Ligand binder design. Sequence first.
Ligand code: NAG
Ligand code: NAG
Ligand code: NAG
Ligand code: NAG
Ligand code: NAG
Ligand code: NAG
Ligand code: NAG
Ligand code: NAG
Ligand code: NAG
Ligand code: NAG
Ligand code: NAG
Ligand code: NAG
Lengths: 422, 422, 422
Amino acid sequence: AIHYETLSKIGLIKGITREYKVKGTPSSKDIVIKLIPNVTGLNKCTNISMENYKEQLDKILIPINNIIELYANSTKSAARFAGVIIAGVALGVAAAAQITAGIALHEARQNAERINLLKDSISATNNAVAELQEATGGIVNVITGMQDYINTNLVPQIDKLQCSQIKTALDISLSQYYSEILTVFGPNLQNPVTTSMSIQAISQSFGGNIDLLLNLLGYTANDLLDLLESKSITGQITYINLEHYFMVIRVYYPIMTTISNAYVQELIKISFNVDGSEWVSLVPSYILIRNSYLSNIDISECLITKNSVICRHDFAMPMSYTLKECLTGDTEKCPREAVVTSYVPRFAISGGVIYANCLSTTCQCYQTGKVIAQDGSQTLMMIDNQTCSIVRIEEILISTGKYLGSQEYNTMHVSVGNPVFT
Amino acid sequence: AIHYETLSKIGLIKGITREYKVKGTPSSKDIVIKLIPNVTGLNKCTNISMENYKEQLDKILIPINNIIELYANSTKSAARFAGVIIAGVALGVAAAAQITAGIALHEARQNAERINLLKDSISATNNAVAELQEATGGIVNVITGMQDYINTNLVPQIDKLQCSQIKTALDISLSQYYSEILTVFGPNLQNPVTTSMSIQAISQSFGGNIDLLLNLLGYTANDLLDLLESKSITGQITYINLEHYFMVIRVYYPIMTTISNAYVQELIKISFNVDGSEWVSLVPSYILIRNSYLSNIDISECLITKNSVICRHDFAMPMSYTLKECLTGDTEKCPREAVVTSYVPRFAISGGVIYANCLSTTCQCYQTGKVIAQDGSQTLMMIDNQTCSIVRIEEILISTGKYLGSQEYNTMHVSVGNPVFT
Amino acid sequence: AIHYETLSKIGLIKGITREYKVKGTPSSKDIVIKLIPNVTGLNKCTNISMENYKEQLDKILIPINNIIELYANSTKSAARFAGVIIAGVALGVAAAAQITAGIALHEARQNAERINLLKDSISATNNAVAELQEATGGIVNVITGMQDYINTNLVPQIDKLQCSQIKTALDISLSQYYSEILTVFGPNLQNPVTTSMSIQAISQSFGGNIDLLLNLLGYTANDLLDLLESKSITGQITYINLEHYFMVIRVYYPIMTTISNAYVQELIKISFNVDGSEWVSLVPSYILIRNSYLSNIDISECLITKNSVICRHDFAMPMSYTLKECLTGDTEKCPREAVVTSYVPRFAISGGVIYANCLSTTCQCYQTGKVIAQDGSQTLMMIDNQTCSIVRIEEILISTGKYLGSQEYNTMHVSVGNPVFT
Ligand SMILES: *[C@@H]1O[C@H](CO)[C@@H](O)[C@H](O)[C@H]1NC(C)=O
Ligand SMILES: *[C@@H]1O[C@H](CO)[C@@H](O)[C@H](O)[C@H]1NC(C)=O
Ligand SMILES: *[C@@H]1O[C@H](CO)[C@@H](O)[C@H](O)[C@H]1NC(C)=O
Ligand SMILES: *[C@@H]1O[C@H](CO)[C@@H](O)[C@H](O)[C@H]1NC(C)=O
Ligand SMILES: *[C@@H]1O[C@H](CO)[C@@H](O)[C@H](O)[C@H]1NC(C)=O
Ligand SMILES: *[C@@H]1O[C@H](CO)[C@@H](O)[C@H](O)[C@H]1NC(C)=O
Ligand SMILES: *[C@@H]1O[C@H](CO)[C@@H](O)[C@H](O)[C@H]1NC(C)=O
Ligand SMILES: *[C@@H]1O[C@H](CO)[C@@H](O)[C@H](O)[C@H]1NC(C)=O
Ligand SMILES: *[C@@H]1O[C@H](CO)[C@@H](O)[C@H](O)[C@H]1NC(C)=O
Ligand SMILES: *[C@@H]1O[C@H](CO)[C@@H](O)[C@H](O)[C@H]1NC(C)=O
Ligand SMILES: *[C@@H]1O[C@H](CO)[C@@H](O)[C@H](O)[C@H]1NC(C)=O
Ligand SMILES: *[C@@H]1O[C@H](CO)[C@@H](O)[C@H](O)[C@H]1NC(C)=O
């Protein structure tokens, strides 16, 4: 829908076209995270109680468990239709986000309560990572923080150091650990009943070592890194065991869906001449095109890759009528901002040819040494190999190809919009 | 003041009511932070000088000390009124923020200079945490970084490793430490004469272990975690000893005050029908109500909890007249934004009943299988148990209660405002 | 150009004047960063392969190398003019930012390929930091992560711990390392062909220890800390050796240039009386003045110091005509915002004298105890030592000097602009 040949006359140069992708329905796996380390390897020091640490955890876990228990009590299985019934009255107030998550919680807990049957086997581990066998032949991946520090730095020195020295080292390392998770699972976790908690925030519970988790889950996808960086991989707390201080976390792993007839087009903005002074247009850099319709896209929440835009949601936004008219060729409605700085692009390469403002900078033909000048009635000069094979702009020598489009481009005039301030 | 029954007709559904709280007058305690570690346990390696490290610290501490000394010199005790006199001429230019802090500095230094009498006892420590006894029977809590690393990882290996290996390990760990505090106490600290430096930034001087500090200060309050996350706990540098490279920090611990007749009301926004297309209103999610007056609140600087909003300041903001008229029932002045995405809430639960847009999604009665339809003249359909006990929205079964309010709600019509773009 | 005596009547009080500085042409040095550690000290444990780690690195390095190789192939040396010729056709689409960087890449690689001749000597190191001698007598600084951990924590325990315990410790520490650099050199690195990648992001490849790097480069400048915090020090990836898994990084070290006749003037904003209610003006806090012209400055991207503003670019922005008229004395065009909070400055010191709103707060003369009152027709009261030597504002005693300017200030009236909402 965008008329590029005319928009380039006001500094909007067609850039790279990318496919639009949004995540779809996830698969899921359950893991167990243990918050209290095994310190029996330090049992030569009888003054270690771990009592203060347990109390500190209660202040975090109980406030959370009280919410999970509410939704778990409110939902029951369903009859003309199959499904799960959630009690609107019991909740009183709920947004669609928590209603949907509440249903997911109900289903997830049907397995979390089976994992809990291993609570004694979960507590009885001393490795940073352990694999427990379920009665059904399934495998539970247990991730415990602190164990690496204890096993490598404290236990080996149990005879070398004094017991007061070891206790001190342990008390400090535990308070450091607590400070780290408090940030994620403390008061900042407004409502645990969600399916969109970033896995990179959850991973803070074991040092922020996201790679360790992904390797254990067994995610080997070639695009795994893109799913991770786009924040498409998330998890949910489904069960908390307060006595043994461990959590059951469900990890959701999305399937990326490419949207048909949908892509994101970027524009390269350079300055141009209007009346002797230098101006830059105020058109959004990224435009989302679907079927044939123009809309805005909030790229700040998406991952930009070599050939695609990966979003965890559809971030399309409404576009004004004046901007749509601008993009379709009515350049009289494209707003301008004055340039008061030196830090502005004055040239770009697109389609193998150069678009440049040769009044604000100097353009010379390498072959002859002659200056490539534009008049005061022109916005931008377009340079191709029918004009000069190699052009020197500033002190950069750029070779060019042929221009595909109108051959009267440099004799074409364009109207401009009004000056605005932001 | 807000008329909820009419606003719900345009997708503004009453949510959770929270109390408004702002911090009041703090109490205070003094701590000492030492920047240079005790490496005499490594005195078998004679090539350790710590000289380069000291020079690096000078580049941070002197620029700060030069400001503290200025205010300390400018303030003197006071006479019709008691108090402290600050010299406006000596300062030349000062904002109220620094004038107030300057007075606090004067008072704090009356104790910091008494702590400094222990400068030899402060330097003569080798533990990460030490408690020194003052002549008056008071206790000074000394927190030192690096000591944990040195005592646990370097000293125990003094005979096992070569002295060049140990020196290298120490030089690297010190440069890592320096890099961390440089971030907080370097050029980014524009002016040290303040009472609002976050305690979580100060804690970077000893690894970011905020829990260690709080445990030593003896803060056991049940709401301590909320005070910390709301950034209500702050500190001030009151004294710097350049020769022995340590700082005296005053920690301010606020008392939360609940504001009478003041609360924050949240609204849940869902889409609604206007003319066949789908729209969302542009009314702020959080409204601050005081006595009977409406105002805006900058929630981005406050902590949102289950039943309160905790702010370090009063973040009330002016509200326009058109928005006040909107909120009090004149829905013709409530601006609309078009929906161009699929990622929008189309239903919510409030008061035990469901508000939903049954044109954009499908609503069925579980009991009969019949569709619950709304006409093209309606914005939203409200569903209660006088209509259908269990309603299937999408594929989620929700049970409902009775609606408290007008029983003619679903036959009531509302005017809407104009379309706008943002 | 700013008329301060009249603007102070509406709460805009002249603050501190700072010089405007922007970075100029850099010098450069090359360093080598190795991604795979030397684990031959652990060769008693035969189950260490490092194979999985290598594959994980390939997923990061290859996507980057494919871009560097493209620009390296496109550029060739140049003939009426000397220089480097870049192929616009081969690239197809490029912004000025990448065209310029592409030229820098060409030149840098002329040395990177000479460093690569030491690829066997680079791999054959086991220290965290090593200095290799080039055939030309030059020195290559090789920085390797992981070596500190391995040499200090794993190797010394090779006989003490079981080999399965050591392998586990190594596998975990490597996955932690990978997670850290993935953040910087993964998908978030949209295009490696740039000269503006922050050195503090690059330093993440070796723990974020920026001080270690700077010490090795030999930067001893007194203003080094300001260059670092202002983000003026950057680097570029010039060469990647995939077989030996190391990168050659060029570090650019800028020369700060003070701009003639250019400075940034800050204004201190306090509230004032208009008609009995309290108001605050909506004029930008920082104004950039060049020669004699007023413009806006985006201070959010600059470092503010005691006497200067240090920017990596020129961040001047256009200023509206209504604001220029406001600043030059037409106070009728200076917009007002209502105060609905208690958290607002009501006084400030500038020029040794006090400007205060003595209707919203209480002002008393220390010497006599009498109240210093202003009428309802006045905005602000200015207090100097010709009125009262020491004034008590709130409970703060401030001494004053003489006012330099009109002696009829307190009998001068000012017009105000219209109320606005934001
Ligand atoms: C435990 O600590 C106490 C001091 O509080 C000490 O007297 C006791 O000997 C310690 N226990 C052991 C086994 O050392
Ligand atoms: C959930 O139900 C159990 C009884 O089965 C009860 O003990 C628990 O307190 C309830 N939790 C909540 C939040 O109501
Ligand atoms: C600690 O771990 C050890 C070794 O796995 C196990 O024998 C012991 O039962 C565990 N103890 C606790 C308290 O979990
Ligand atoms: C200009 O470039 C095109 C390829 O883009 C080529 O076919 C044509 O021959 C070239 N013309 C000249 C004069 O170099
Ligand atoms: C200190 O370092 C020097 C090398 O600079 C070395 O010759 C000397 O032996 C070292 N001192 C000791 C006690 O090893
Ligand atoms: C403060 O006064 C002392 C003398 O008591 C002087 O040595 C010091 O330099 C002064 N500091 C400042 C910032 O003026
Ligand atoms: C280092 O600490 C030790 C043990 O507390 C003490 O004996 C010594 O005086 C301290 N030395 C220095 C230089 O502070
Ligand atoms: C509807 O719910 C209310 C409680 O909110 C209950 O008192 C009433 O009997 C219910 N009516 C029906 C038909 O279920
Ligand atoms: C390497 O690991 C295997 C188990 O996978 C073990 O059987 C073998 O003994 C180990 N090698 C050595 C030298 O211990
Ligand atoms: C660059 O040229 C070399 C041949 O010299 C080729 O092997 C390599 O694949 C080319 N790289 C790119 C990106 O074209
Ligand atoms: C590892 O480092 C050692 C000691 O510098 C060196 O002898 C050896 O060749 C290195 N091995 C590898 C694989 O780089
Ligand atoms: C007021 O202060 C000035 C210096 O700013 C001084 O010269 C003058 O004598 C002072 N006047 C009185 C009455 O204190």
